[PDB]
Amino acid sequence: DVKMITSLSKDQQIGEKIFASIAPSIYGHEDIKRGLALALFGGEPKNPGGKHKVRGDINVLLCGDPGTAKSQFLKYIEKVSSRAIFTTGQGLTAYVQRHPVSREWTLEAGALVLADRGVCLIDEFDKMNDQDRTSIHEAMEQQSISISKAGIVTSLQARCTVIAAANPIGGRYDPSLTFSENVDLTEPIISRFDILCVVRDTVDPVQDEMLARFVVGSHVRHHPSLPQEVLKKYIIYAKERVHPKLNQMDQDKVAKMYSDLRKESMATGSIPITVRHIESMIRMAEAHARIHLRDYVIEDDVNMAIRVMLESFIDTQKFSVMRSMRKTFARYLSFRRDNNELLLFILKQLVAEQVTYQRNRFGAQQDTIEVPEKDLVDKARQINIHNLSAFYDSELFRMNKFSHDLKRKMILQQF
């Protein structure tokens, strides 16, 4: 049963192969796919020897304008996971109830004690009530509830990972303010979440076809005229037969970043990475011990842990700070990413802004946008790659419906 899993984990490249196995339908969002995959298997719930009770649960909080498949991300995790439950925010704790059959006034379980080891899927987080809000926070940093109700005084257990999605105020997330404004949530609550993914939207021509075609086709094959087998048995197996260890070679590899970034953030209107972010990073350290069976901390997945713990912090920032901190760190951290995506980041904007120009004077939603070449390498000089032909050959940009011409220099955009 494991004899396959041995080499399948020893592929050394199971990351990409597993990321695109969750979120089976919904296109895009290989960013948030990463975070949610980190959350699913979890981390390591180590017991600190100083009686401090650090927790081993990853809690996520989506957010973004309506119509971006948040609820589907909740519903699919209902299925793939195990012993999961679900709720809306528009029953969270055990309550006295008159039994249907026995006709005695017993106590019934709520909705945070039915995930005592699995996951708790909260929906419509904003619509929670004041009692619900004062009751949800207690279980985050204590993971234990007391019930001195009409029934009897008890103290039960609740060890669940929370997966919720809020909404943007004003019907749209606007990134001029900080994320702590468009979320409409009490401030010491957002600290109780490890990841803060921000879903957003933009009118982008080349993705309109990509999303349309997908939906239309999903309406063609549903009416009366890594697959779902490897990863379920894999979340069953890899949950059990690993116990990640912790050496002390990474203990100083991070502080060199903190000492810099704390100043970098405090310099402007923001609060830098604080200890409740280092805890999340060190929790997501082991989040890959479950995928690789690695279980040994290495300077490799620390490049991943720091990368993620800043990924979930640069987005929740101000207008020009979300880009100033990027110009510093996204180039500083030496992102262990594609050399090609950084190529697209340029000409995507250089064609989108040109369309925005050619609309505010003409107005015609023109067919074939035209952009000469010279502009691209001008900005490529900043990242120092200057590679176009090896990218021209790469089919990682044909899908984005572009072109190039050697004698015309035109990056012709069709759609």
């Binding site: 010491p188 405090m266 609060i271 604080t274 200890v275 409740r276």
Partner: protein
């Protein structure tokens, strides 16, 4: 012992360092003055109050947690 003052105010905030005055004062609140009743029954206070103004930089939450933990009776509220 002669230097009885600083020996406490040194071991009441190990993690956070800097400006022991903000730790000097906290030493007194743990002891407090004494409750007097004048002939008129017009009692007097027996406790003190402290304000730590400044930006929330999480350097103070540690101190709150400490003073709550090391207190005969104590509650930390949001």
């Amino acid at each position: 012992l002669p230097n009885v003052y600083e020996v406490i105010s040194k071991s009441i905030a190990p993690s956070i360092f800097g400006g022991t005055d903000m730790k000097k004062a906290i030493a007194c609140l743990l002891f407090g003055g004494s409750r007097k009743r004048l002939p008129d029954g017009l009692t007097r206070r027996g406790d003190i109050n402290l304000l730590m103004l400044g930006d929330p930089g999480t350097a103070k939450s540690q101190l709150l947690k400490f003073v709550e933990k090391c207190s005969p009776i104590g509650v930390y509220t949001s």
